[PDB]
Amino acid sequence: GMSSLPAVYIVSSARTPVGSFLGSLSSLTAPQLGAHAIKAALAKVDGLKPSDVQEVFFGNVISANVGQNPARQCALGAGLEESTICTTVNKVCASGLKAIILGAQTIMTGNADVVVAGGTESMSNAPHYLPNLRTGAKYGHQSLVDGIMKDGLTDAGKQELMGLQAEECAQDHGFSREQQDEYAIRTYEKAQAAQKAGLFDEEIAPIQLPGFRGKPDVTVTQDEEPKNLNPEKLRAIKPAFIPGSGTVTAPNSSPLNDGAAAVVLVSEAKLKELNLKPVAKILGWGDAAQQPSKFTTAPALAIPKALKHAGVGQDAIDAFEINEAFSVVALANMKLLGIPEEKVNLHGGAVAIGHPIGASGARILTTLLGVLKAKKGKLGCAGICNGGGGASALVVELL
Amino acid sequence: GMSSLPAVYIVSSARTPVGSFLGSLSSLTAPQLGAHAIKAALAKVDGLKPSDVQEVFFGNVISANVGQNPARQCALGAGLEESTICTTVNKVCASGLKAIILGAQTIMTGNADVVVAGGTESMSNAPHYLPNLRTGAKYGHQSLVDGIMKDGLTDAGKQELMGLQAEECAQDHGFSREQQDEYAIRTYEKAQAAQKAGLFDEEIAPIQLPGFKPDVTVTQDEEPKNLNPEKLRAIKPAFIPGSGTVTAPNSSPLNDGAAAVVLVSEAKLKELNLKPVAKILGWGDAAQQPSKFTTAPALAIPKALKHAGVGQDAIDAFEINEAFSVVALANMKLLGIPEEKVNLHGGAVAIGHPIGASGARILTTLLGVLKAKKGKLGCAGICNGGGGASALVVELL
Amino acid sequence: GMSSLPAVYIVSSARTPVGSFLGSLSSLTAPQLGAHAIKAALAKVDGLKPSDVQEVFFGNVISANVGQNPARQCALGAGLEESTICTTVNKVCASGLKAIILGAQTIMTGNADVVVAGGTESMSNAPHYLPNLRTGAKYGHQSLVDGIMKDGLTDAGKQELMGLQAEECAQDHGFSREQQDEYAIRTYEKAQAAQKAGLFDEEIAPIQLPGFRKPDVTVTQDEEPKNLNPEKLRAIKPAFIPGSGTVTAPNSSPLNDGAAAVVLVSEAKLKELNLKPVAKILGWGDAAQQPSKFTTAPALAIPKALKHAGVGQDAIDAFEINEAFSVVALANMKLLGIPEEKVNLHGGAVAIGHPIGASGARILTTLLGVLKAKKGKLGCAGICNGGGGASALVVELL
Amino acid sequence: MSSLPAVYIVSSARTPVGSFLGSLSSLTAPQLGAHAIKAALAKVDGLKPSDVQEVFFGNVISANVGQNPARQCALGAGLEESTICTTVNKVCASGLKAIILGAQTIMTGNADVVVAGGTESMSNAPHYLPNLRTGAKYGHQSLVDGIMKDGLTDAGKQELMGLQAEECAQDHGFSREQQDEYAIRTYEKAQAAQKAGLFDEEIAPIQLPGPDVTVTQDEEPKNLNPEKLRAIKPAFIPGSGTVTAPNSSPLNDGAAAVVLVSEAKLKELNLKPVAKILGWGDAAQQPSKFTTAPALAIPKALKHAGVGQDAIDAFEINEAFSVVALANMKLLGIPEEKVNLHGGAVAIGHPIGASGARILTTLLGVLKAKKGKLGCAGICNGGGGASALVVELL
Numbered sequence A: 001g002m003s004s005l006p007a008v009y010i011v012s013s014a015r016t017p018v019g020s021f022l023g024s025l026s027s028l029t030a031p032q033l034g035a036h037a038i039k040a041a042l043a044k045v046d047g048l049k050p051s052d053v054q055e056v057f058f059g060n061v062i063s064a065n066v067g068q069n070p071a072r073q074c075a076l077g078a079g080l081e082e083s084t085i086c087t088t089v090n091k092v093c094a095s096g097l098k099a100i101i102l103g104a105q106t107i108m109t110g111n112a113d114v115v116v117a118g119g120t121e122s123m124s125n126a127p128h129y130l131p132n133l134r135t136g137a138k139y140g141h142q143s144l145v146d147g148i149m150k151d152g153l154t155d156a157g158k159q160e161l162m163g164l165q166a167e168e169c170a171q172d173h174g175f176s177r178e179q180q181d182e183y184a185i186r187t188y189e190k191a192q193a194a195q196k197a198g199l200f201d202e203e204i205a206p207i208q209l210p211g212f213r214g215k216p217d218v219t220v221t222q223d224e225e226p227k228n229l230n231p232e233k234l235r236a237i238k239p240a241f242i243p244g245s246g247t248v249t250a251p252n253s254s255p256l257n258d259g260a261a262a263v264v265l266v267s268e269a270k271l272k273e274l275n276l277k278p279v280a281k282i283l284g285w286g287d288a289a290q291q292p293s294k295f296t297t298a299p300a301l302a303i304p305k306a307l308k309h310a311g312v313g314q315d316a317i318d319a320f321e322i323n324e325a326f327s328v329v330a331l332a333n334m335k336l337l338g339i340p341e342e343k344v345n346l347h348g349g350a351v352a353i354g355h356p357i358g359a360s361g362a363r364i365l366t367t368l369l370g371v372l373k374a375k376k377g378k379l380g381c382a383g384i385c386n387g388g389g390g391a392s393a394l395v396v397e398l399l
Numbered sequence B: 001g002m003s004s005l006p007a008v009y010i011v012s013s014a015r016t017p018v019g020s021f022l023g024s025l026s027s028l029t030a031p032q033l034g035a036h037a038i039k040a041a042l043a044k045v046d047g048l049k050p051s052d053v054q055e056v057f058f059g060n061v062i063s064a065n066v067g068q069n070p071a072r073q074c075a076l077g078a079g080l081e082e083s084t085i086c087t088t089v090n091k092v093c094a095s096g097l098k099a100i101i102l103g104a105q106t107i108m109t110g111n112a113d114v115v116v117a118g119g120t121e122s123m124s125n126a127p128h129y130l131p132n133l134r135t136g137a138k139y140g141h142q143s144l145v146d147g148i149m150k151d152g153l154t155d156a157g158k159q160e161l162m163g164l165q166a167e168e169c170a171q172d173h174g175f176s177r178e179q180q181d182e183y184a185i186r187t188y189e190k191a192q193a194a195q196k197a198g199l200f201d202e203e204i205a206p207i208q209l210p211g212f213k214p215d216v217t218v219t220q221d222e223e224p225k226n227l228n229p230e231k232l233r234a235i236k237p238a239f240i241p242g243s244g245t246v247t248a249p250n251s252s253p254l255n256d257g258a259a260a261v262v263l264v265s266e267a268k269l270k271e272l273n274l275k276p277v278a279k280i281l282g283w284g285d286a287a288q289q290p291s292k293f294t295t296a297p298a299l300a301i302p303k304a305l306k307h308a309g310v311g312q313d314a315i316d317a318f319e320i321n322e323a324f325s326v327v328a329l330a331n332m333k334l335l336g337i338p339e340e341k342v343n344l345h346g347g348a349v350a351i352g353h354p355i356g357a358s359g360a361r362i363l364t365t366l367l368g369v370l371k372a373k374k375g376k377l378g379c380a381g382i383c384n385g386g387g388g389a390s391a392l393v394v395e396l397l
Numbered sequence C: 001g002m003s004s005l006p007a008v009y010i011v012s013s014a015r016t017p018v019g020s021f022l023g024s025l026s027s028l029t030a031p032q033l034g035a036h037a038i039k040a041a042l043a044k045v046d047g048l049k050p051s052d053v054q055e056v057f058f059g060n061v062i063s064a065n066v067g068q069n070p071a072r073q074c075a076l077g078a079g080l081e082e083s084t085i086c087t088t089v090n091k092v093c094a095s096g097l098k099a100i101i102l103g104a105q106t107i108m109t110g111n112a113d114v115v116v117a118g119g120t121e122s123m124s125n126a127p128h129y130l131p132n133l134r135t136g137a138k139y140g141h142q143s144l145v146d147g148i149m150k151d152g153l154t155d156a157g158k159q160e161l162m163g164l165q166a167e168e169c170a171q172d173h174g175f176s177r178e179q180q181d182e183y184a185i186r187t188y189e190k191a192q193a194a195q196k197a198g199l200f201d202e203e204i205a206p207i208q209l210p211g212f213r214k215p216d217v218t219v220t221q222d223e224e225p226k227n228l229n230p231e232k233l234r235a236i237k238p239a240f241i242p243g244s245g246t247v248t249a250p251n252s253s254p255l256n257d258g259a260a261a262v263v264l265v266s267e268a269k270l271k272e273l274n275l276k277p278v279a280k281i282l283g284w285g286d287a288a289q290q291p292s293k294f295t296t297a298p299a300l301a302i303p304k305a306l307k308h309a310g311v312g313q314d315a316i317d318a319f320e321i322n323e324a325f326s327v328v329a330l331a332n333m334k335l336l337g338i339p340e341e342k343v344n345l346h347g348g349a350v351a352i353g354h355p356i357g358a359s360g361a362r363i364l365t366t367l368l369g370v371l372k373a374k375k376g377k378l379g380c381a382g383i384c385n386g387g388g389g390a391s392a393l394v395v396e397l398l
Numbered sequence D: 001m002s003s004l005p006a007v008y009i010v011s012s013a014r015t016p017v018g019s020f021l022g023s024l025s026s027l028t029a030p031q032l033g034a035h036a037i038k039a040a041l042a043k044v045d046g047l048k049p050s051d052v053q054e055v056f057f058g059n060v061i062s063a064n065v066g067q068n069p070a071r072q073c074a075l076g077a078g079l080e081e082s083t084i085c086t087t088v089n090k091v092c093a094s095g096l097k098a099i100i101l102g103a104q105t106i107m108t109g110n111a112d113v114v115v116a117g118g119t120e121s122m123s124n125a126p127h128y129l130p131n132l133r134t135g136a137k138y139g140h141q142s143l144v145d146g147i148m149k150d151g152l153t154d155a156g157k158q159e160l161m162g163l164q165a166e167e168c169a170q171d172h173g174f175s176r177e178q179q180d181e182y183a184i185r186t187y188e189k190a191q192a193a194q195k196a197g198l199f200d201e202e203i204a205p206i207q208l209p210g211p212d213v214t215v216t217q218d219e220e221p222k223n224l225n226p227e228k229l230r231a232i233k234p235a236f237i238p239g240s241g242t243v244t245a246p247n248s249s250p251l252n253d254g255a256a257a258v259v260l261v262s263e264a265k266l267k268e269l270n271l272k273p274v275a276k277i278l279g280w281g282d283a284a285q286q287p288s289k290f291t292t293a294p295a296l297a298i299p300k301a302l303k304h305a306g307v308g309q310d311a312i313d314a315f316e317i318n319e320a321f322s323v324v325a326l327a328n329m330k331l332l333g334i335p336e337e338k339v340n341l342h343g344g345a346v347a348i349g350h351p352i353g354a355s356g357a358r359i360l361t362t363l364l365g366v367l368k369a370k371k372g373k374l375g376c377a378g379i380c381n382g383g384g385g386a387s388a389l390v391v392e393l394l
């Protein structure tokens, strides 16, 4: 039903390299990564100034110790004006894409004409928690809570790691250890091929880390995870969540990662005022939810909803991004929707690229735009599940 | 500009009592408080079921150790369907009002017909943080970070507590210690008067706590009773020794609480023949230099008024959030709003300030003020750390 | 074999009140408690100056965050000279008595003529530990280790709390929940009757807590004895085994703060300064067995100490068998054939408190008072310690 | 002098001394202690471990080590559950005071076979959270580094030992350069002893389960870099300081143990004694002057032993800092030609609860290599104390 609503255009997008856990980007905070992606995205739009950006929505899940309003720090660090309206969004893994939806809605209701939306996550710098210090604990051992485990990866109702609910997904939909492993191998091979062909070069903004006291500068140019594929070692590794008979493993699951992505949205009127060249048009979107432990297949609800909102049939989509929280998540949603893997994650997915949870919703959108360009497509759809039972999805047209 | 767009109706609101820091509600988590407010608000809507709610936006600032997606936990805790779309919102103190704005917009773009929005905060249960445990620290004493200070009350760019930037406001706009104290006494008096007259009874959803002694029912806000005028005037300053003007009595406290509103489209109102409490006429966000966040409402309130097509002089009551007494004094000065139209049942200095919920808390109180004082047009404005503010214009029906 | 060795005389003893966990003395550090007991004991010796103390041995178990050499801080806090030799001793619950033995041996080898020995513990101010912050721990929940549990109350081998091994002592030697409870009640009533007759007045040095910018507080009494409630005691749940448990919080010793000290002198120094000796050390004995059997290790240390002193078990007028748990005193009375009517005549640690690093010296302080009040000459003190050990000491009241 | 029964050392042993978070950091303090006790006992032909009656073991930072570190050392070494075990803390002097108490227990007849020494795992010293029981309602809190609090900070003045080392440099007139040249000389002496196999006998190598790794050498002596050492910035007083990390002792892991027997037990079992304890001396003075407390304890030990200072063939003066060795040599008139002949802790390592026993094991090796007979070990401790011991090599 977006035909009746004002149009929203993507005029640029950019992402950081995705760094490994405690890896290439672990020295940077989440707002520094976010600032980097925002600044890089704005620098691609000819005829737009960063001072033109009126409002920011930015996803961030594990915000502990990031400081007041992560999104605000992202905006100011990227050089945006202090007049810019900033809001931090948390829909767990869907945060980065819900941020873009809210951004588009803010243009559609006429409250802004230029919006930056995206997400960022530094899982390396997620802290540990001491919960009982204010009132005290008179006697007994206490727990230092891992913020990643508690606020990012554990279902609140069942107190179950997402990995265990991924095993619930493999059981419900009949995917073996071997099927998940061979999917993971294929998505690494796609990510390495895209890397080698330079197909991430446009979307990635390399990061320059100046050296400290005499030490040499470091440039981080590529995602860290794709090169780690060892097929023999992958097929032989122990399961990560269920001993012995488990089907989910560290290699066939998304890793923990650091990264950020950002898109620049403008109204039809601003496109005309500044004579900007749009990259893409947002056609529609959809959020959906179901039983929390079945979050893995919520995209099978969000994607049809988004396609209906956009007025597009599933068969007209040229490329899908289905976020690979786990290999089995992509396999199960492909099966439920009847989407062949030859249309899914054509440059690889999060199992091979990395999964900075608050950024991945926007990261897969930047990659999708690069896939449509490289494969000469027009219609694309991104969908991402989130712990708690939800999923979000968005449909774009490349222009 | 909102008058060209689909109408958004408030059909109910509710709030928890506001508990003191480590006080009457400290045993409850932020989602338990949020669920309580949401359930209470929906119970007031004749002809609407909890299963009609399609989407939830809920503010929450200090989310550490609250678990995955605090808004989702509030929704499911309140008995909403697992189909409900849930998003947590952080705009620091403005979070609870920005959540309501986002819910209105979601109705206006046609993606929902029934939306719950608000905020919650449990400052009592904010944890401390241990950084650097992943990489290690070879040798030396290490710090445990107070999450309230870090993620709630410290300006990121200058690493200054909000109360130091309140001093900046008093210096910038010329408000003395005495003017701030007299303002604080007046707003405590208004809160106590409203308390005794029962004017909070409708908006407050009391909380029953089992005993660890017999059971306790929390029915009143905890802070208003603490006013001691003589002690307030004599206490030492809280952020600048000797010369400071900002004190703990004349600042907002740390608090626990939640508030929720139920929003519906015109079509849903007509389909179910719902009785609206209020109509959203417009809103506005604004921002300026981060250490000047205290007077960002002087930008957001005219923006919300223009968006609603309502002149400032037609507003019957304002809610200017009292992050500090000097914040209300400064914004009243800059906008030329008489205090006789401001926080008529008291403000956060006297009631409490659960940061993620206060933007929604003041809207709930505003609806009550408009009814009690027989007003029609209200405006709520709230500032937030980082330099921002949010404001909303409503019409009581 | 103390007959051919130099004689060691006790010229004074003193202890703090024993405060409950997070209770009346919780604002004081272990060296503040220890300095208080040292200073008070010296104040009792007519003709001796604090500057005459040459060496200090002080027990302390949970020494984390206490700072360098707890014993040295106790000595200096009490006003002893910076020339004073100071060593901190840890034999868990036996620390305070082993310190006295080591002080006695140092006089016997001629290396000192005046020694202060004892023990202190602030279980209140025992910290928690963060053990992997140096190397780091990349992912997962971590533990904050309770220092009382880890360094005070857990057997290192089998990783069990002392209370669980107390149950083992109940099973091994056949004592019921009710028998332990009736022992607990009796020792509480003995503690309360001594409190009421002022029989602790001489050994306790009251503590004055200066009020901040707030009234002063004087702590005069041990805090635990008044807590006896026989109906609640007999009806409380077990504290270490949910189902068949027999060991309870009321019939175990509590967590406590306190210090005690004694002043030791050689034969030649006693005469040179013309001091009235309170008692004479006749012998001592350390023993050890299986760690989880530490409860009955005093049944070895006590006969050993008696043999070392040349005195017979039936000659002893009063015994102090320390009450780590009610069942500990019951089992040691059973094995050794000692009637309860000669054991802890003013109550025991179950009712008085158990500052683990101090209790070995606290019970000797109380034993000297039991000997004076009950008209006795020979006394033996015994105390087990976690890990399987025990220490015992024989004294003659003069 | 003393008129006490004879106490003989029938053996000694030490672990290699590992660097802070280095080659031994995986091991706990009682694991290192047990390793040293077991190796020491295996060297006495005719004595079984079951003959050990009592143990005194030094350990300073005992946080998170568990009940009675000395007991864990004894049982870990395979000693009988009947063995009496006491843990001793006299800060850096703990390992030598432990040996003194062990000797005294033989002398009063309460034992005929005593094991004594010390252990320390500074790598595994934890951090403290001090106010969790009563709580802290608002505000950033602090985690205490256990090393700094219980090992290296004078309780009176809240000053690290290095700052009081600067006080030593100023009091007795020792320059940055003089402290550096002492440091290089002691590193050189330790490197030479290493290459000549002179630590092979005293060191009991540690086998770590992997590929498996074997620790055979002290880790610190290879670190000497004279250029960097003379150029590095001071570590306790910026700009003008004289004390540095290279000329100070490091943080280290390690244990050492000695086996003591009475005359009667030596005769009954026909044991060949390594040495005889002749005397000892503890002394103390102003806490911030702990650096020169050995200048009191050494004369005291010598007098107790009936030995004049000039008759000592070799001294071990523990090198808590380079300036500590300089100041005590200057005050006692001891020429550097007779001090720490195989290097000291500035080059070897300084696991504080073990160092007092460590230098005694090394002193026995120095006396044998240098054809000496009378040796004296002295070690200062934070808080103002020092301990010293005199042995005769047999």
Ligand SMILES: *CC(=O)SCCNC(=O)CCNC(=O)[C@H](O)C(C)(C)COP(=O)(O)OP(=O)(O)OC[C@H]1O[C@@H](n2cnc3c(N)ncnc32)[C@H](O)[C@@H]1OP(=O)(O)O
Residues within 6 Å of the ligand: D091, D092, D152, D161, D162, D187, D223, D224, D225, D226, D228, D229, D232, D235, D244, D245, D246, D248, D249, D250, D251, D320, D321, D350, D352, D380, D381, D382
């Ligand atoms: C009661 C008593 O007896 S007191 C004795 C108790 N122990 C102590 O007092 C320990 C005192 N020492 C310390 O507290 C620490 O070791 C200090 C803080 C002094 C050293 O910490 P640090 O981080 O500065 O030391 P390092 O990590 O080892 O780095 C030092 C720096 O200097 C280089 N370097 C070390 N040793 C060298 C030698 N022998 N030769 C040449 N260079 C050396 C080292 O490579 C480092 O250089 P960088 O390149 O800057 O890292």
Ligand SMILES: CC(C)(COP(=O)(O)OP(=O)(O)OC[C@H]1O[C@@H](n2cnc3c(N)ncnc32)[C@H](O)[C@@H]1OP(=O)(O)O)[C@@H](O)C(=O)NCCC(=O)NCCS
Residues within 6 Å of the ligand: A093, A153, A162, A163, A188, A228, A229, A230, A231, A233, A234, A237, A240, A249, A250, A251, A253, A254, A255, A256, A325, A326, A355, A357, A386, A387
């Ligand atoms: C699964 C998880 C616990 C990782 O555990 P981990 O074992 O420590 O992960 P690692 O990086 O150490 O990988 C383990 C092993 O697999 C190897 N490995 C990793 N990726 C590999 C690959 N593609 N090919 C071959 N080997 C691989 C590693 O080399 C390592 O081998 P090793 O045992 O010899 O060291 C963590 O990544 C996780 O929880 N992921 C899920 C994230 C998530 O849930 N996101 C949100 C979804 S809703």
Ligand SMILES: CC(C)(COP(=O)(O)OP(=O)(O)OC[C@H]1O[C@@H](n2cnc3c(N)ncnc32)[C@H](O)[C@@H]1OP(=O)(O)O)[C@@H](O)C(=O)NCCC(=O)NCCS
Residues within 6 Å of the ligand: B093, B153, B162, B163, B188, B226, B227, B228, B229, B231, B232, B235, B238, B247, B248, B249, B251, B252, B253, B254, B323, B324, B353, B355, B384, B385
């Ligand atoms: C100001 C602040 C630090 C409180 O500090 P505090 O020292 O703990 O203040 P307290 O609540 O403990 O009360 C201090 C004294 O004032 C008294 N007091 C509190 N409210 C009073 C009142 N209304 N009238 C008279 N006396 C009062 C108390 O009785 C207390 O007395 P005491 O010293 O004898 O105990 C904290 O509440 C704060 O940071 N407020 C600002 C929070 C904020 O920034 N919110 C977001 C804004 S953007």
Ligand SMILES: CC(C)(COP(=O)(O)OP(=O)(O)OC[C@H]1O[C@@H](n2cnc3c(N)ncnc32)[C@H](O)[C@@H]1OP(=O)(O)O)[C@@H](O)C(=O)NCCC(=O)NCCS
Residues within 6 Å of the ligand: C093, C153, C162, C163, C188, C227, C228, C229, C230, C232, C233, C236, C239, C248, C249, C250, C252, C253, C254, C255, C324, C354, C356, C384, C385, C386
């Ligand atoms: C056993 C231990 C865990 C106590 O745990 P605890 O339950 O928290 O102890 P508490 O005193 O707080 O609780 C005791 C309960 O019984 C009551 N109680 C305690 N002593 C009582 C007494 N003499 N008479 C009647 N009631 C008593 C208390 O009122 C309390 O009642 P409540 O349920 O209403 O709160 C702890 O004290 C311990 O480990 N002791 C062993 C000491 C030790 O190991 N020493 C060295 C070994 S060698």
Ligand SMILES: [Cl-]
Residues within 6 Å of the ligand: A289, A386, A387, A388, A389, A390, A391, B069, B072, B086
């Ligand atoms: Cl959800």
Ligand SMILES: [Cl-]
Residues within 6 Å of the ligand: A069, A072, A086, B287, B384, B385, B386, B387, B388, B389
């Ligand atoms: Cl802002």
Ligand SMILES: [Cl-]
Residues within 6 Å of the ligand: C288, C385, C386, C387, C388, C389, C390, D068, D071, D085
């Ligand atoms: Cl033992």
Ligand SMILES: [Cl-]
Residues within 6 Å of the ligand: C069, C072, C086, D284, D381, D382, D383, D384, D385, D386
């Ligand atoms: Cl000392």
Ligand SMILES: [N+]
Residues within 6 Å of the ligand: A201, A202, A203, A204, A205, A206
């Ligand atoms: N790029």
Ligand SMILES: [N+]
Residues within 6 Å of the ligand: A250, A251, A252, A253, A254, A255, A351, A352
């Ligand atoms: N992976």
Ligand SMILES: [N+]
Residues within 6 Å of the ligand: B042, B043, B044, B045, B046, B047, B048, B049
């Ligand atoms: N209803």
Ligand SMILES: [N+]
Residues within 6 Å of the ligand: B201, B202, B203, B204, B205, B206
């Ligand atoms: N109500």
Ligand SMILES: [N+]
Residues within 6 Å of the ligand: B248, B249, B250, B251, B252, B253, B349, B350
């Ligand atoms: N207040």
Ligand SMILES: [N+]
Residues within 6 Å of the ligand: C201, C202, C203, C204, C205, C206
């Ligand atoms: N007394």
Ligand SMILES: [N+]
Residues within 6 Å of the ligand: C249, C250, C251, C252, C253, C254, C349, C350, C351
């Ligand atoms: N008790």
Ligand SMILES: [N+]
Residues within 6 Å of the ligand: D041, D042, D043, D044, D045, D046, D047, D048, D049
């Ligand atoms: N042997």
